[PDB]
Amino acid sequence: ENSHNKARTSPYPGSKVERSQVPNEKVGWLVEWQDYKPVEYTAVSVLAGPRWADPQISESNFSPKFNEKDGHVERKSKNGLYEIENGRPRNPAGRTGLVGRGLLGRWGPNHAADPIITRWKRDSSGNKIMHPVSGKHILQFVAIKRKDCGEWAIPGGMVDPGEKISATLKREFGEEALNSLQKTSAEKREIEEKLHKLFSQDHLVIYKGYVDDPRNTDNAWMETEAVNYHDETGEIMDNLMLEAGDDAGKVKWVDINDKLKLYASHSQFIKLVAEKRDAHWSEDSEADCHAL
Ligand SMILES: OC[C@H]1O[C@@H](O)[C@H](O)[C@@H](O)[C@@H]1O
């Protein structure tokens, strides 16, 4: 039922490295493939050993505790246990044609968080807006357009070592969508005040676990936790100006519907939020295909 596909594209991000070909029937690790010969690649930046990266497996003093909280490094996958073979993790979604870590710092799961902040779209009078096709109100969420992607996306990022997911969600939203890193500390508190209120009133976990990402390898992969914080009355997000963080091209409130084109698997997350919030989704019924 559909193997990961982005995790098998070439060349590997930021390189000219080509992955070994993996036929769809041979994606699952359960499938025997004695001749499987993935290319080995770990980015120079990762091999250099920065603070956010693990050492190579051979590193004498390195004894990772996979599938567990390993000190300041969360090695548990949100999709359950992952196998350890040849002393290293095996991607839970299957073969990718490349071993090593590529651009990912950690062996195993590399955690990210995606805060989906939503509010109902409102008119000049502060009332919700009903869509005629669905009869449901239009919901909006805060999206950013990165300069490196030029694609609209949920404002998320990597969990920092020793940081809790709830903290990552709040930090990323503030830094990326409210440009909090460029605030006078005084405003950083009016923000943490509004976000404190927001991040405690109406939240739902939308998705947790593996994400098909082109940075994934046989031994390291991305995982995210997408969580929706919703402002039902609009009173929390009404007087909060959006301002793109240094690494977000633009930021804006985006109307949600099934025509929305988003980065990665963010459109699927948004569809789930619309479902849970009873928001408008179907833009075109395709009824004219029978309308006569
Ligand atoms: O692709 C999975 C995740 O990767 C992270 O680097 C991004 O910041 C997230 O928005 C994305 O959901």
UniProtKB/Swiss-Prot annotation:
GO BP terms in the entry: ADP catabolic process; nucleobase-containing small molecule metabolic process
GO terms of molecular function: ADP-ribose diphosphatase activity; ADP-sugar diphosphatase activity
EC top class named in words: hydrolase
Location of the motif Nudix box: 157-179
Keyword Amino-acid biosynthesis assigned: no
One cellular component (GO) term of this entry: cell junction
Superkingdom of origin organism: Eukaryota
Reaction equation(s) it catalyzes: ADP-D-ribose + H2O = D-ribose 5-phosphate + AMP + 2 H(+)
Annotated Nudix hydrolase domain residues: 120-276
Assigned keywords, A-Z: Hydrolase, Magnesium, Manganese, Mitochondrion, Phosphoprotein, Transit peptide
List of residues that carry Phosphoserine: S63
Flavoprotein as UniProt keyword: no
EC number: 3.6.1.13
Entry cofactors: Mg(2+); Mn(2+)
Tissue spec. comment: Ubiquitously expressed but isoform 1 is the most predominant isoform.
Subunit comment: Monomer. Interacts with GLOD4.
Entry similarity comment: Belongs to the Nudix hydrolase family. NudF subfamily.
Function text: Hydrolyzes ADP-ribose (ADPR) to AMP and ribose 5'-phosphate.
Protein name in the entry: ADP-ribose pyrophosphatase, mitochondrial
Organism of origin: Homo sapiens
Residue window of the full protein shown: 59 to 350 of 350
